[PDB]
Amino acid sequence: IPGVATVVERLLNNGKALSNRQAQLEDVSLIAYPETNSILVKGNDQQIQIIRDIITQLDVAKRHIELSLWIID
Amino acid sequence: IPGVATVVERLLNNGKALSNRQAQLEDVSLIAYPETNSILVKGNDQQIQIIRDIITQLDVAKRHIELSLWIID
Amino acid sequence: KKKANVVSRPVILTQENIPAIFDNNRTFYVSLVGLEHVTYGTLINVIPRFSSRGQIEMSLTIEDGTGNSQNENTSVLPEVGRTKISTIARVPQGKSLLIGGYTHETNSNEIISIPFLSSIPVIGNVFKYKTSNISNIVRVFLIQPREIKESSYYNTAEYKSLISEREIQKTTQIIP
Amino acid sequence: IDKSELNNLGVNWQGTASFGDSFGASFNMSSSNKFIASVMALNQKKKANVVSRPVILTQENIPAIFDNNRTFYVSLVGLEHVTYGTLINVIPRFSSRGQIEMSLTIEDGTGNSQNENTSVLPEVGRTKISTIARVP
Amino acid sequence: IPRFSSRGQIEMSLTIEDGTGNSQNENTSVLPEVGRTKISTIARVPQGKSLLIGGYTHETNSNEIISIPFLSSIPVIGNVFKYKTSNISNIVRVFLI
Amino acid sequence: IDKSELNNLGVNWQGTASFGDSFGASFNMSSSNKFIASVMALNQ
Amino acid sequence: QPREIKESSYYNTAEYKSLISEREIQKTTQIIP
């Protein structure tokens, strides 16, 4: 299961354009610091804005499922 | 069994034209984030429109079949 | 005659889309009249997630059962064989599904008799030899999942310290 | 928590008979002077409660390891032991509203070691669970 | 590995192993025989206080009753046919710094 | 810190009986002259 | 059940049992009188 840092950094890769939007420029520096479970970002204002929006839309709740497996003989 | 991300990304590959339609431009960035079972997409408006349509037409219900195998001696 | 009912239930909690592993094995003993054991083990690894209308879909690998260990010892102990099922299914919330199962029925008769005299009316029935066996077996693997809500936790509101403050002071205070 | 009840009562019979030096008869025998009966009558109940609690402290987001194993002895009337071991490695951290999320790998249980010795000792089998969960 | 921190607190990275080696007439009853325990962690302590980094408690209760079915139920002498075995045990182990 | 208490008391019985040279009986025995009892009483 | 460790979760010690006594050390490593 990849991390948010890896996924987002690989997303912002090999694209030659500007004027972006969000659906429900140069290379950003996005690294993971798990010691405090944080992400260090470096980029333009538009890039950091889309990063904040995409991360907020990305991690929310992670609901819990409990499974009971009945075996009857 | 390949994933929707892999299949669609390999579909949108090596084509030099525009003016597309759907039957029942540049390279898009389509990656899979299974931690929340989602797909991150990057592309033009036409490309994202066809991606949404093709995915919606792609995954629907996955009906259930139960097989009973009688062995008689 | 012999009859046996066995009901086992593993229960495991996890977060959606993240694999969970649960394996276990116990040994069941029975003491002779004047010590036979069966090792019952299960192993379930599952990937759960949600789907439209709050249904729960799961990819399941399940193995379970005993290990063969032959005076009525096997008659008392479970001895339910071994069964592995690998599949994937989705369940509406509030209902349970029968993903796997296996039934078996056996009937057998055997008759041995002396050819001629065993056919005489009255005492002939002393020369026959009749053996009969009948058996029914049913085994079922059902699943029922459920989402964990705020009412599924246990209210504790306390914390039993392992060791007492007075005990610690007594054991590491400077001697008076 | 374990409860068990095993009870058996009844009689088993085997027999032999002879008539003159000519007629031999064997009643309920596998293969070749008079009847024998084994009478059994017994009922045994058993109950056991075991509560174990490992407790480990660490700093958030930093893995912690705790493993332990003891040996429990019982002296015969006139010396049986069971080795109980646990091993828990955990990665804890915080989450919204001060909830505590943890990635857990837990193994625990005893090792099989067969006169009521097993009846007295824990003998709780073995269980391993690997998962991740968050708690208010 | 120790070091200092704000307000003179002491932070430490700890790897601890301790315990005995299994060596079976009341010999084990007299000798310690405290099992084996390893704990690896990291914690910080205010100066002047002590912390319970690790610990483990255990409680066991067991009963067993064997009896002849019928006669052992008679009022007075029936109690001579039973056989009652009981075990209770509490264990506490604590690692403080 | 460890505390432990183990205690057991009771009787176990085994028996054999015969009648003539014809009827044999074994009471609470695994397999083949009169009754034996083991009395246990101890607390440690 | 997890819990965050607060200032009330420590044990008040405020002392330090030395392993060996100052008088004992002086007796064992002082020049003989």
Author numbering:
A (entry chain B), B (entry chain C): 207 to 230, 261 to 309
C (entry chain B): 362 to 395, 401 to 436, 443 to 548
D (entry chain A): 310 to 341, 350 to 395, 401 to 436, 443 to 464
E (entry chain O): 413 to 436, 443 to 515
F (entry chain O): 310 to 341, 350 to 361
G (entry chain A): 516 to 548
Give excerpts from the publication.
In the present study, the OM ring map obtained at 3.4 Å resolution allowed de novo atomic model building of the constituting domain. The resulting structure includes the N3 (residues K180–H300) and the secretin (residues I301–I520) domains, and the residues K521–P548 of the previously unresolved S domain of MxiD[SctC]. Natively embedded in the outer membrane, the OM ring forms a pentadecameric (C15 symmetry) assembly. The secretin domain of MxiD[SctC] forms a large double‐layered antiparallel β‐barrel with 60 strands in each wall (four in each of the 15 secretin subunits). The proximal opening of the OM ring is lined by the N3 domain that contains the structurally conserved ring‐building motif (RBM), which promotes the secretin oligomerization. In contrast to this, the S domain in Shigella exhibits a unique conformation. It laterally enfolds in a long loop (K521–I535) mid‐height on the outer side of the secretin barrel and ends in a helix (S536 to Q545), thereby embracing the two following subunits. The amphipathic helix interacts with the later subunit through a hydrophobic cluster on the outer wall surface (W306, I308, V368, L470, V512, and L514) and a single hydrogen bond (T544). Overall, the S domain exhibits a relatively large interface area with the two following subunits, creating an interaction network, in which every single MxiD[SctC] monomer is in contact with four adjacent monomers. Thus, overall, Shigella and Salmonella adopt a similar architecture of the secretin pore complex but use unique conformations of their S domains to stabilize the β‐barrel.
The type III secretion system (T3SS) is a large, transmembrane protein machinery used by various pathogenic gram‐negative bacteria to transport virulence factors into the host cell during infection. The T3SS is a large, syringe‐shaped, membrane‐spanning, multimegadalton protein machinery. While the needle is a helical complex composed of a single protein (MxiH in Shigella [SctF in the unified nomenclature; Hueck, 1998]) (Demers et al., 2013), the basal body comprises multiple different proteins, either forming membrane‐associated periplasmic rings (MxiD[SctC], MxiG[SctD], MxiJ[SctJ] in Shigella) or the pseudohelical structure of the export apparatus core (SpaP[SctR], SpaQ[SctS], SpaR[SctT], and SpaS[SctU] in Shigella; Blocker et al., 2001; Lunelli et al., 2020). Here, we combined cryo‐electron microscopy, cross‐linking mass spectrometry, and integrative modeling to determine the structure of the T3SS needle complex from Shigella flexneri.
